[PDB]
Amino acid sequence: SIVGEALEYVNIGLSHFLALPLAQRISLIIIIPFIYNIVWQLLYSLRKDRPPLVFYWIPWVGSAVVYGMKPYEFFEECQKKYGDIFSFVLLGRVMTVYLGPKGHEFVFNAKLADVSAEAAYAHLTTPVFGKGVIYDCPNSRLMEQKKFVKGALTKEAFKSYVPLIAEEVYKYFRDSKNFRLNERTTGTIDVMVTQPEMTIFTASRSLLGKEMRAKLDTDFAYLYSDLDKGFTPINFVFPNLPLEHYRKRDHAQKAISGTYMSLIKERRKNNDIQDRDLIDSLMKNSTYKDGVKMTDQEIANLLIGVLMGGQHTSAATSAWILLHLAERPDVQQELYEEQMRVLDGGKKELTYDLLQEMPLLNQTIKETLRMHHPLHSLFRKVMKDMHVPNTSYVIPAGYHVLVSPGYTHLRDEYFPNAHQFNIHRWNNDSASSYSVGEEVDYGFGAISKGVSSPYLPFGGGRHRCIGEHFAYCQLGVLMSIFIRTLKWHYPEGKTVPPPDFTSMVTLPTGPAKIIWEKRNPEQKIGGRHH
Numbered sequence: 001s002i003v004g005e006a007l008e009y010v011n012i013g014l015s016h017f018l019a020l021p022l023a024q025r026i027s028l029i030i031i032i033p034f035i036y037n038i039v040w041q042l043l044y045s046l047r048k049d050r051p052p053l054v055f056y057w058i059p060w061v062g063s064a065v066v067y068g069m070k071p072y073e074f075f076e077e078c079q080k081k082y083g084d085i086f087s088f089v090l091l092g093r094v095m096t097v098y099l100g101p102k103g104h105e106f107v108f109n110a111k112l113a114d115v116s117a118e119a120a121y122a123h124l125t126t127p128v129f130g131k132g133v134i135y136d137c138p139n140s141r142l143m144e145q146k147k148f149v150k151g152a153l154t155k156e157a158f159k160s161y162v163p164l165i166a167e168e169v170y171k172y173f174r175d176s177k178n179f180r181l182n183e184r185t186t187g188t189i190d191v192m193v194t195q196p197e198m199t200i201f202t203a204s205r206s207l208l209g210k211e212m213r214a215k216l217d218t219d220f221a222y223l224y225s226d227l228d229k230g231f232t233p234i235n236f237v238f239p240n241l242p243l244e245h246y247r248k249r250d251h252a253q254k255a256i257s258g259t260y261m262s263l264i265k266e267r268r269k270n271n272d273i274q275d276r277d278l279i280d281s282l283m284k285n286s287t288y289k290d291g292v293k294m295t296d297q298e299i300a301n302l303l304i305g306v307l308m309g310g311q312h313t314s315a316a317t318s319a320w321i322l323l324h325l326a327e328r329p330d331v332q333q334e335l336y337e338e339q340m341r342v343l344d345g346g347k348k349e350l351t352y353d354l355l356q357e358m359p360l361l362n363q364t365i366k367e368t369l370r371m372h373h374p375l376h377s378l379f380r381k382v383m384k385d386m387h388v389p390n391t392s393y394v395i396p397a398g399y400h401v402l403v404s405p406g407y408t409h410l411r412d413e414y415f416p417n418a419h420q421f422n423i424h425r426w427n428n429d430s431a432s433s434y435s436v437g438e439e440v441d442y443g444f445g446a447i448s449k450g451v452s453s454p455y456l457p458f459g460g461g462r463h464r465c466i467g468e469h470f471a472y473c474q475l476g477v478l479m480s481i482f483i484r485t486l487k488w489h490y491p492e493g494k495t496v497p498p499p500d501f502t503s504m505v506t507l508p509t510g511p512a513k514i515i516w517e518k519r520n521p522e523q524k525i526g527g528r529h530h
């Protein structure tokens with residue numbers, strides 16, 4: 001009755017393990033975790049309190065490749081096999097996806113104690129934006145940061161932003177190599193070159209002021225290119241690697257925030273604090289409710305985050321608008337007629353109020369944002385075990401939840417013919433969004449309490465967008481002028497490109513080219529240029 005004889009051979013076996021040839025040990029350090037991975041999934045599948053987990057061969061990596069390249073196609077397949085709730089492994093993390101409006105509710109309206117946005121996001125935003133703001137702070141501070149920024153995002157602010165944005169668009173048609181409307185009546189542009197440039201010029205001039213705008217006319221502009229380099233999700237896998245690239249990022253953040261603090265410290269020194277910018281605004285209004293004031297460094301880091309977030313979502317969207325309208329001359333024609341009616345043949349100057357009377361223009365943005373949500377996935381880290389109601393499921397702390405209103409945007413059940421671009425699906429519903437009923441305030445204004453709308457381009461709950469009206473104002477001025485000034489179409493055989501999902505935002509796969517021509521070949525844009 002000796003099991004001792006077996007316990008010796010355990011020890012013996014361990015000793016022989018340490019004496020295998022390296023060719024068999026390396027092999028083992030590969031085969032052991034691979035074998036163990038597969039048996040763990042097999043066993044995991046039996047738990048009834050866990051959503052189905054998507055099968056994967058490579059440990060740690062998980063479904064990263066397929067998710068990273070075609071997330072919506074990944075979601076549709078998983079949805080057919082497993083339904084609306086499923087998990088998948090992603091570079092070391094377990095992601096629990098909840099699709100559809102009930103997913104929007106589950107994730108966007110999760111209790112503050114259940115999930116953390118900053119725990120999912122901080123490890124990219126912080127190196128790009130700087131410390132102490134956005135996701136490098138507790139949620140309550142973020143809530144008030146959004147409140148501060150919203151104080152420069154009023155109707156009265158938009159009324160003064162409109163002519164500023166319009167002047168920038170005209171200067172851009174006049175001076176940019178991509179246009180030069182005074183010298184060329186037709187031409188070809190890559191919209192992934194023009195829109196990011198037009199977006200930074202207009203957003204700077206209005207949110208940052210003329211000083212910062214003027215900086216863009218110099219080599220300073222390169223720093224923004226550098227800073228944006230660090231805003232690619234190789235940095236979620238690798239937040240800090242001691243290579244180059246990471247260093248222009250860090251350098252840019254320091255140099256750009258330095259430029260903002262310089263301006264800030266000079267205004268306060270010269271008593272020059274008015275009501276022009278987001279900068280004036282945060283200088284007058286950045287004291288938290290417990291009495292602590294934001295530092296000049298935190299104010300500048302917040303400016304970087306706000307400008308950069310708004311940079312990428314808006315430029316991607318005007319790119320898609322131009323790309324969809326280029327094969328839809330009927331929509332351009334219709335948008336033009338609206339321009340002629342609202343602006344009295346173009347003899348009325350565009351104002352923020354006149355923008356609100358251009359429903360087809362706004363529906364075109366609304367529709368573009370339906371087909372091309374610039375953020376295909378929003379994440380939280382689960383902080384406390386979460387029960388999914390009317391199910392047996394429990395999402396344990398340490399998991400991540402993934403919500404994807406952009407996927408619902410593309411479902412026929414909610415938007416008939418969802419892959420067809422049609423601005424008329426929004427007739428007499430041209431509002432950028434609308435609180436479908438009751439409201440709640442998390443610290444930056446009252447917003448819809450329910451988040452079950454299948455159309456959720458600006459998310460919802462405490463992390464909801466506050467840039468929506470600014471985006472519509474900027475995209476609206478932009479497109480109003482494009483429409484009244486140019487017609488445009490594709491080179492022969494070209495069509496709307498597929499999205500490049502691997503980036504920060506769901507940009508079109510470049511180069512995405514369109515051919516423009518002046519509606520009025522003789523029209524000249526005034527003002528001086530080199």
Ligand code: HEM
Pocket residue numbers: 117142146306307309310311313314317369373374375378379457458459460462463464465466467468470471
């Ligand atoms: C077409 C344009 C835009 C779209 C579709 C969009 C979308 C979104 C979404 C979906 C969220 C929620 C993120 C989450 O739940 O994890 C969000 C948050 C936010 N956005 Fe936007 N956005 C746009 C433009 C802008 C602009 C122009 C700005 C700044 C001027 C901006 C600033 C912000 C800020 C400060 C938050 C809050 C983040 C948080 O509370 O965690 N967005 N946006």
Ligand SMILES: CC(C)(C)[C@](O)(CCc1ccc(Cl)cc1)Cn1cncn1
Pocket residue numbers: 121125134233305308309310313375377378379465467504
């Ligand atoms: C830059 C911020 C504001 C923090 C951000 O929320 C970053 C959040 C975020 C960025 C990238 C991916 Cl893949 C997922 C989430 C983006 N944004 C939202 N509206 C406009 N930009």
